């Protein structure tokens, strides 16, 4: 998965 490529950043 990626935390990421659903986070706001």
């Given at each position: 998965?990626?935390v990421?490529?659903?986070?706001?950043?």
């Open positions: 998965q990626d990421n490529t659903a986070v706001a950043w």
